[PDB]
């Protein structure tokens, strides 16, 4: 997962699935899978900070865009059968202590 | 009773088969592709559990404690090391008869203790 978030050896397109109960691990490089981006959450905090949003706000003439957002490990593409191992939060609201 | 199990020959490594010694009345196992014979220590052959009350604590893997998608409570402390986090889940097994019983798996590294309440 760390190499995919820096996009070194592994394109962001490769999906990787750790199924615990059956002990398998699966890595699909195959074409045709369907994946949508998600923000990443480390501990209880989003990895999207304010400094990222200020740079995107000014995106014009910064040459700073989505690919530079994905390359910082803030957003991640997650296809379906990797959504079985994930916990999603609807909004940052669910992250705060209830 | 026991759920018994296979035995293999020591030469051709095939499946030994149970057979009866008529002279000494002693259960034997014999490969059918050689003359190898061995005396039966267990004396049970075919055992079948129809009621099949099954112990899930044997199937459960201790690695399950790393899954984010499972719930956990600090209500039930670990029985061995007294750790508060326990990640509990149901059978997760088809043909479980009717069980909503929760099985508990202790978090914290390497404890892996697995109990049922
Ligand atoms: Zn044999
Ligand atoms: Zn423990």
DSSP secondary structure string, B45-107?
A: -----SS----GGGT--GGGGG-TTS--BSSS--SSS--S-EEEE----TT--S----EEEE-
The structural domains of chain B, ordered by start, are: 4-48 (2.20.25.10), 49-117 (2.20.25.10)
Helix (H) / strand (E) element for A15: namely strand A15-18
Q: Does B61 touch chain A (CB under 8 A)?
A: yes
Method: cryo-EM
State the binding site of B for Zn(2+). Answer: 9, 12, 31, 34, 78, 81, 106, 111
CA atoms within 13 A of residue A40's CA, in its CB half-sphere: 16
Contact status of B74 with chain A (Cβ, < 8 Å): no
Binding residues of B: 9, 12, 31, 34, 78, 81, 106, 111
Q: Tell me which residue of A49, A52, A35, A50 sits closest to A86, measured CA to CA.
A: A35
**Residues whose CB is less than 8 angstroms from the CB of residue B25 and which lie 6 or more positions away in sequence, other chains included:** none
- Say what the resolution is, in angstroms: 4.0
Of A83, A97, A98, A3, the closest CA to residue A36 belongs to A83
**Residue B60 in contact with residue B115, Cβ under 8 Å?**
no
Q: Which residues of B77-104 are buried (b: 16+ CB within 10 A; e: fewer)?
A: ebeeeeeebbbbbebeeeeeeeeeeebb
């Amino acid at each position: 997962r760390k190499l995919r978030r820096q996009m070194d050896i592994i394109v962001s397109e490769v999906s990787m699935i750790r199924d615990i109960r059956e002990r398998e691990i699966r890595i699909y490089t195959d074409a045709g899978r369907i994946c949508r981006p998600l923000l990443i959450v480390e501990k209880q905090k989003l990895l999207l900070k304010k400094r990222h949003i200020d740079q995107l706000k000014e995106r014009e003439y910064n040459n700073y865009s989505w690919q530079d957002l994905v390359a910082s490990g803030v957003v991640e593409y997650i296809d379906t059968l990797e959504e079985e191992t994930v916990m999603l939060a609807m909004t940052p609201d669910d992250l705060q202590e209830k | 009773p026991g759920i018994v199990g296979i035995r293999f020959c020591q030469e051709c490594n095939n499946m030994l088969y149970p057979k009866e010694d008529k002279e000494n009345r002693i259960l034997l196992y014999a490969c059918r592709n050689c003359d190898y014979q061995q005396e039966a220590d267990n004396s049970c052959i075919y055992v079948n559990k129809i009621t099949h009350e099954v112990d899930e604590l044997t199937q459960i893997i201790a690695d399950v404690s790393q899954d984010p998608t499972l719930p956990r409570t600090e209500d039930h402390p670990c029985q061995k090391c007294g750790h508060k986090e326990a990640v509990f889940f149901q059978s997760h097994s088809a043909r479980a008869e009717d069980a909503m019983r929760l099985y508990y798996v202790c978090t914290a590294p390497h404890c892996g203790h697995r109990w049922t309440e």
